[PDB]
Every structure is written in C-alpha cells, then in structure tokens.
Amino acid sequence: SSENKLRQLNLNNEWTLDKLRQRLTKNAQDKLELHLFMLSGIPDTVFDLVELEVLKLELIPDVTIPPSIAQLTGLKELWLYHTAAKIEAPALAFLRENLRALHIKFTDIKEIPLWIYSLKTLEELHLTGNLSAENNRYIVIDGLRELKRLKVLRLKSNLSKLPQVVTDVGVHLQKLSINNEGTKLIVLNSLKKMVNLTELELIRCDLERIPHSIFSLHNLQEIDLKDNNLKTIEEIISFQHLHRLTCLKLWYNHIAYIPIQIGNLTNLERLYLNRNKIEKIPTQLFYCRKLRYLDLSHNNLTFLPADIGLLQNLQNLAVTANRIEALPPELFQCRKLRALHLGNNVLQSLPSRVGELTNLTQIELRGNRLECLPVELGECPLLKRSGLVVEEDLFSTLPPEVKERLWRADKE
Template structure:
C-alpha cells in the first residue's frame, strides 16, 4: 500500500519552479491532490470493508421465494414471526431496488413483491436453507467476483491511475531532459537578476533621471510660483513671518529629497552583475533558437484534456452499474443445492457518492485545462515585447524576444510581472554599458591613469588606452595631456568634461564607436589639431569628424585585413584649416571629396595596399600641395598630373612598379622640388636629363635595379642626400667628387670592390654607408672626412682599417659599424679616440 506522501511526491516539482506555475497550474495542483486523496480513501475503504452478502433462491416462485426473502432480511435463527408492518417495509425496499435493477430482473422482482404481499395472509414462517456458514462464505466470495460489476471493484484503482497520469502530465516539462536544463538555468538566472544589487541600482538611477526630468519641466512653474510668493510677501509682512516660523520645505528641496538613494555596489556585486549580463546573453542566444518548451507544454495540456474527456466518458457509462442488489448465478448447485443467489453490496451507496464527487472534480479540472488551451492558442506566446517596460524603465533598447525565451517570460508574468521587468534590465545594452562605465571609473582612477602617461618621440605627453569598455571619467582630469590614443574602446563617449583638457591637440581613435556630446564637440572643433581614425568600413567614420573646423591634420586608416573597399570619405568642406591628409586604404581613384580642400591642402599621403591607382586628375586642382606621397599604388610611370604641381617640394613614389623615369625631365618645371624618392621600384637606369633638377637636395633610388650611375647625376650641385643602396652597382664614377654639398651617401648592398678616391673630396659627408659590398681596402684619405659621424663597413672584404680614422674626430665607436677583429687591429691610441663619448648626434638614413 502506498502512503499519501509517497504518491504525492510524484506531483511535487522543485520549489524553485513555482514562478513558472500560473494560477491554473496551481489550481489544478490542488484539485489533483483532492482527487488523489479521494482515490486513496476509496481504495482504503474497499480493502477493509468491501464485500457482498448472498442468500439462495428456491425453485418455487411463490411461497419459497417469499420465505427466502423474509428469512434473509428480517428473521433471525430463533424468530419465526414477522409483523405486517415489516412486510410493508420489505415491499417498499424491494420496490426501490426494482428501479435500480436491470430490465431483465424487473419482472421477476415484481412477481416476488406481489407474492410477498399475499403471503402475509397465508404464511407467517420463513424458509430454512440448511446451508453451513462455510458455504455462505464461499458463495459470498464467488458472487463478489461473478456478479459484482468490475467498475465497482476497480474504481479506486482507476481513479488513482487517472490522477497519476494528470500529475505526471503537469510536471513532464520540468523533467524532460531537453527542457529541464533550460528551465533550471532560466529560473536560476531569473532569481539572481531579481536579487542582484545592480537591479536595484539601475531602477534607482531610472527613478533619479525621471525625477530630474520632472524637476526640469517644473522649473518654469516654480519660478512663477516664487515670483507670486515674493509679491505676496511684500504685500503682507505677517504672512512672511508666518512662513518663516513654519518649518515647511520648499518644493524644489522636496523634489530633491524624494530622489531615491543610489545603491552602492562593491566589487563583488559588480562582477556578479557583469557575469549575469553575459549569462543572459548566452542563454538568450541558446533558447531563442527553438520552441521545444512551448510545444511540450501544449502537448502535456492536450494530454490532460484528453485524459479528462476519457475519464468523463467511460465513468458516466459505467456509473449506473453500481447498485445495492445483484443477482448471482454461480455454477455451484452441486455443492449447495441452489443455482440462483441474491446479493447485497454494502459499499454501493458510498461508491456512488464518492464517484459523483470524483466526476465533479474531474469536470473542474477539465474546464481549467480547456481555459489553458484557450490561453495558449489565443495569445502569441512565442513573442514577448518589452514595450511597456521600455517606457517605464527608460531603457529604450530592451529587445523583444521570441520562441521559448518569450514563452518562459509569459509564464513568469502570470506569477508576477515584476520578475520579467527586472529581468529586462539585463537584456539592455544601455544598462550593461552603465555597469561597465561604473566599473571602469572605479578601476581606472586618476592615479592609475597618470602612471600610464608617457612622453613620446615628439616630446608630447601621451596616454594610450586599449580594449576598455569606455573612456574613464578620470581621463578628462589630465589637463596637461596632449595626445590621447583610444584603441578598440567598446563605447567611447566623449563628455563635456573634456573642456578641462586644454592641452589636448591630438586624438587617435582606432576601431572605436565614438559618441561626442554637443558641448564636447564644440571644444574639439576649437582645439583639436590632429585626428587619427582607423576603421573597418568608411561608415564607421564618425559624422562629427567633418565638422572639426580647426583640424589641421587628418589620418584615415582603413583596415585592409577586412577586405572591404573604401569608397570615399564624406565632404571635407568644413575643414577649412586642413593642411595634411593621410589616406591608407585600397583606393582605385582619389576621392572626389579631396577637391573640397584642394585649395589649401599642403600635404597629401596615399598609401594603397597594392590596388592600382588609376585616376589622378584631381591632383591638378591641388595648386598649393607641397608634399605628395603615392606609396604602393602600382604606378608604372610617373603620373603626368604631378607635373602641374608647381609648389611641390617633396615627391615620394615608394613601392610602386615604376620601371622607367624618362618623364623626369618634366620635373624641371617644378622649381620648388627639393626631394625625390623613387625607392622600392623596378628602375633600371637613370636618364641623363636628371641634371635639369638643379635644386634637388635629396634623391632616394635605393632598392631598384640600377647597374650604373650616369655622370649627369653628379651635376646636381645642391644634392645633400643620395641613397643608391641595394642595387647592382659595381662602380661609383669619379664624378661623385663634384658633389661638394653631399652629407649622406649610401651604397649598401651593391657589388662594389673599391671606392674612387674622389669620394673623399666630399668633405661635408656626415654619414657613409658602405656595408654589404666587396670592398677590399679603404683609402687613407678617409681622414679628410672630418665631419663624418657614421660609417658602415660591415660585411666587406677588408683586412684592416686605416689609422687615419682617428682624424675623423666626430666618429665614435658606437657609430662605426665594422667587425670586431678589424676594430681590435687598430692602434690603441686610435681606439681610445673612437671610444671617447660624444654628444654629437649620429646622422643615419638621411635624417
């Protein structure tokens, strides 16, 4: 026998799931409990009291049947008399039983009744059956199994099975493996979200913002009220005295006092809230992919409804079979001498009453199930909108959810809507950004930021912040900061407090979604001089970039790893002070927006990723351009558009595919050109017309395919820097001695075996790069280069160094690049001179 506790445990769900039980599930829970107890009660009574009592029927249909009924109902073993009143009672009893018997036995009992009515006049004694007690017990048991209907015997067990089916159906979605894990996770997260201190703080901040807005709206009304009050006070001194004596609080102070206190979060609370945001994000992405929970709940509700219909149908069918009197015909005449027995079932009356109660509870249960189905199909439970919560909580970005996530929230709303409202805080990116900002400001204090401030190569104070959730507020307290670099900041919000950074001139934004408030933008427009932007798509360029009216230098760096084409930056018309424009991208033509600043732009740098730059006609409009760099643009010739840039001073065509430079003669019209960089190309020869570039001071031809240097090259008397490194030169012409102003000369990585003695007439040489050649000896005339500060002789075929190196007083050991054994072979006094420290700046790479 099962105890009530053991059976009820089948229905008990975990207490943590109570928030997912709407009122109808709770109502059905108690109804099922009542039905369960009813089934157990009937079963217990049936096991202890269920039995039938039977008496035999004689073969005579008149006096014998009358005597049998008289003896079984009213006679004892010694009493042989009966009163006429008892016979009347028996007649009435049999009349009632006739109504509950089947139609086949109605006629027989009518005959018996009539015989009983007539027998009172003729017979006053009952009929003995002469059966033993054991025979009566045997007949009772036989007739219990033969004559008693099966529903009378098995009703409590069927009721118990029905109730268990209903209970299992109610809890199946809590137990099914593919849904229980999601439900448990959801309930766990929901409870933590409800109890999280960040939830309270977020709601407090919202209430504070709403109070502030109401205060702003009422400022006008308050000012009018104060004016009226002042007028009244002037007119009535007594009123003024009364007002001063009363302890009333002004309305403005009251509104400020009504602002709820802000909850203070410690580090543990903030970390917990941060983890909750991540858990909610992952749970949402996991649960929104399917609607299994919704379907399972619908299926189990349908199963309960069908179970109710099944119970109702067959119970009503078999309920009429429960009667008090039954006619039994067991095949035991050879044992008892009687073939027919009449039996009474002592539990019939109780079973009928309990069955009616069970049907009533089943009907109530079924009606609730039908309502549940109506609710499931009437409302769109696979979508959940936070529209009302967005209005109340001032969090406009709380997203709408779908599928199982939406269904779970709908179920929670039936328990308490406050749960879903608080849960929505952790779906909001605005709320998450506020938490991140709170944590960021607490972690990055002014003291910590000051430790990260460095002095860069330009002798400017610089701060570099990378991969943070936002800009710490303490950054704006660094009033002496000149360069601010922000790299991969999730939400770079520049606040009006930036006005305190009066020294800020340069701003770097790498992969940052930047939001600038109006007051801060005004400050940047007035003070910012240089802006570096690195982005994946040109749409990531902030729109406020094009309104920085005092900006002088703009760097647009397109992330080439993103493999997206940069179309063009926006209009530059408002950048009236822009002097330098740097574009690092994969352009096929120069952006048309450059024409907006062509009249006052002095420097243009284009660094392509190897994409061929085709259209350059826009260069003709840049009349004031002084520096032009077209690097890695796959140019095959020098663009003709360059020849119209009369103010051009520095031209850099690095890393292109230029093979011939015959057009160089056209450079003679560029009277301001002093620097020409044709390095990292495919140039095989230098035309003799190069001598027309009489004002040229810097010429970079390194990393090409030159084999000879023409004599015309050495007619450039103003040439100071000449770099022909990493070519295929075997000889340096003696005409190199004509370059009396030469200060930097590099022939590293060629095939030189000796140097012309005329080279050492260039007494202004400060840097001489001769490494990676095949030079066998160094002339003693090296001592003529008294201004030499840097000498590279490494990886040559030298067997010694001339002692005249000691005459190069500015040359020191640190700037003498040579093998150690050659330096060790020098006289000791020469080594001592070279080892002396000097403050002279080393002149390397033409700088």
C-alpha cells in the first residue's frame, strides 16, 4: 500500500545503518542487542545488522515482523514490550526454527501474538502481565503445551495459584521463576508434578511458610524464596532428601533462627540467609562442609562460632551489617577465602591471622570500630589497594612498604 510505503521510507531514512550501529548495545549477558522504542514501525535497515542476537521492541504500534528478519541469522531473542506484532508465514517459519527466547510484557490479550504458541524451538518464555480473561482463566498460557522444547518459564502475573497448565509442562521444564509482586501464591500440592526442575524461584509470593510441594522436586539444584515473609524455616528438614541441592537462597525474609537440620543439607555450596532476623548460627550449620559462598549479612549476629573453621572450601563470606565484636581465630583456617565482607559491624580489631589468607583479594572493613589495621594484611600476595576497602586513615596505619606494594599492584 502506498501509505505504508511512504511511512516505511521515512522510517528507513531516519534510521540509517550508522545510527543503528550507534544504538547497539553489548548487553549484560554479553549479547549484541538492539532496542527500539516509540517509533512508528521497524526500520528495514534493522535487518542488515547480521550480527544481532537480541531484538527488543517497546511501545511500537501496528508492527508487522517482515520476511527480512530471516537475514538476522544469529537472532536468538525477541522482546515485545507493549508491542502487538503481526507476521506472515515466511518470517514466522524463520522464528519457529531459530528463536530461543521470547519476552512479552503486555497489558492485555491484544498484545499477545496468537502465533507464539507455534514457536516450536523456543527454550525460554518470559511473561509480564495478567494471564486471564473473563471465563478464560490462564488462557494466555493454555498453549504452553505446544512449546515442547521449553526449558525456562518466567511469570510476573500476580497469580493466586500456580496454573495447572504450568505444572503439566513439568516433564521438560528446567527452570520455573515466579515473581508475584507480593501477591500471595497458593501452591497446594500441584507443584509436585514438575519433576524435571533443577531451578525454582518463587519471589515475592507472600508464601509465609515454605510450601511442602517443593519436597517432591528431587532434581532441584537451586531454590530462591526471596521476600516471602518467612519467619521460621523448620520445613528445610525435608530438603535433606533433595540430593542435588547446592544453592539455597532464603534471603530477604523475616527468619528468626536457623534450624539445626540445615546441617543435613550436606551438598550446599551457596547459602544466602542475608536480610533476615537471625541472632546466632547453630553449630550444625558447619556440617555443610562443601560451602563455598555464605552470606549472613544484615542479620543480628554478635559472634561467629569457632566451627566456621571447618568450612575448608569457604571462598566468599559476607557478614555485613551485623554487630560482630571480634573474629574467631579459626576463621583463618579457611585458607580458600577470596572475599571477606565485614563492613558495618563493631569490630574492634582485625586479627593478625588475616595474613594467612593466601588467596584473599577483597576485604571490606568500613564502618567498624578499628583504631588501626594489622601489618599482616601485607602478607596477602594477591590483595590490591582496590580490594582493601577501608577508611583512608586506617589504610595509613600500614607500613609504607606495604602501602606502596598495594598501590603498585593496582597499576601494574
């Protein structure tokens, strides 16, 4: 049509290849992406960007995805933010055979392309918006069954319950992520069907108690229950049967204590308990002897038990913003430590045994009640001034020789 042609010509003239290349971004996931927003359509010059991996369209009306999309032979992801998208069969056949991730943020069904359920090779789907209509609960995802290659489903949709169609896709799904924006999710036994899941995120779902369905997910490797108003977590006793569980995130809750049965989660390598209300660490936690990452920051801890020295694989330890008076000497038996986040405590001294931390590259000390610093920080071969985060006057207490080598290490 003549009207469409003139509008398209004008858009192409406004979006030269040089301008598009200046707009490209190497994004956080190291992917080459183009983001377009608030335009009248898609400039045809987009499809000369043959290196593109991610296309993001935001708030673009009346969009038609054209057959030249097949020129983007490395396109893997398409993001549609408030952008309805029409397509003909050649462009769709290309997406059906090559697109790996689809993100859609939508206001209502009008912004959901009916062709998305035919995207037979899709591995990830991310939906942000309400999934239901009158007499049509969860219709937006009824078609998930046809996405037989799907590995990752992310929903940000204020769900009262987990839709049955989700639990049905559990044979092949590997990662389920729900961000419920504080809407209480009721799980009630249906989650047990997602036997292939290795990663589960139930974020901001007002769970209050860890749901018992999780115990049936015997392939789980990682669980994240951020911001669910958890006060007690006795239910972790049943995690002892999840033999592949290596990452437990219960951060950002109201947890008042750590049950001793945490020590039977013996395959834990990363444990995040930061931003809770915990006052002490049970000694049984140190039976989690494969721990590499431990974050207990922003709790109410006064001391670290001597048994922390039994965590021989500990590499990153954070206890920021507690009220710890001193560090046990046994902490420095943890020879693999690389990072020690100790800020905003009430430390009065930093033990001389820090010199034994051969692999230390990062130590945050600010906001403590230190009068001086110990010379033995100079014994840490890999530490640089940029990794020693402390007030300048405290840094000055080190020997000039030590201070010289820390400064050099950065500039070398």
